[PDB]
Amino acid sequence: SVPKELYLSSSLKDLNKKTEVKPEKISTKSYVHSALKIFKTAEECRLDRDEERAYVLYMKYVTVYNLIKKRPDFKQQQDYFHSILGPGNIKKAVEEAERLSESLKLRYEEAEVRKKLEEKDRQEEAQ
């Protein structure tokens, strides 16, 4: 009947900042906030034991950090931004990713050779 109450922004120009897909057109602080949400989720998945999703989330976080860290504003205010992030969560993100990737590497080979062993089982004579 009536449009939902404004909650999300104050201007059209502000809403547009959420429509960008190019890093060039995304503020350091946007990504930092996005990174937080990603990190929260990453943790929840690791504990749930979903290695694929957790891995991706940790990695994406790391990929974001490695993208933004080299910007002038981040450099000057890394104190500040590390506050917004979890200080030394970039550390845990890196370590969880290697932990996970080394797990995944093995499980993906496990699934491959099984798949290959599955077919062989089918592919026999039986007169």
Swiss-Prot record:
Post-translational modification note: Tyrosine-phosphorylated in its N-terminal half in an EGFR-dependent manner. Ubiquitinated. Inactive form is mostly monoubiquitinated, but polyubiquitination happens too. Ubiquitination is increased in EGF-stimulated cells. Ubiquitination of active form is undetectable, suggesting a possibility that USP8 deubiquitinates itself, thereby regulating its own function.
Induction conditions: Upon growth stimulation in starved human fibroblasts. Decreases in response to growth arrest induced by cell-cell contact.
Localization of this protein: Cytoplasm; Nucleus; Endosome membrane; Cell membrane
This protein's domain notes: The MIT domain is required for endosomal localization, CHMP1B-binding, maintenance of ESCRT-0 stability and EGFR degradation. The rhodanese domain is sufficient for RNF41-binding.
Disease: Pituitary adenoma 4, ACTH-secreting: A form of pituitary adenoma, a neoplasm of the pituitary gland and one of the most common neuroendocrine tumors. Pituitary adenomas are clinically classified as functional and non-functional tumors, and manifest with a variety of features, including local invasion of surrounding structures and excessive hormone secretion. Functional pituitary adenomas are further classified by the type of hormone they secrete. PITA4 results in excessive production of adrenocorticotropic hormone.
Stated family: Belongs to the peptidase C19 family.
Oligomer and partners: Forms a ternary complex with RNF128 and OTUB1. Interacts (via C-terminal UCH catalytic domain) with OTUB1 isoform 1. Interacts with STAM2 (via SH3 domain). Interacts with DNAJB3, EGFR, EPS15, RASGRF1, RNF41, YWHAE, YWHAG and YWHAZ. Interacts with NBR1, RASGRF1, RNF41 and IST1. Associates with the ESCRT-0 complex and with microtubules. Interacts with BIRC6/bruce and KIF23/MKLP1.
Protein name: Ubiquitin carboxyl-terminal hydrolase 8
Gene behind the chain: USP8
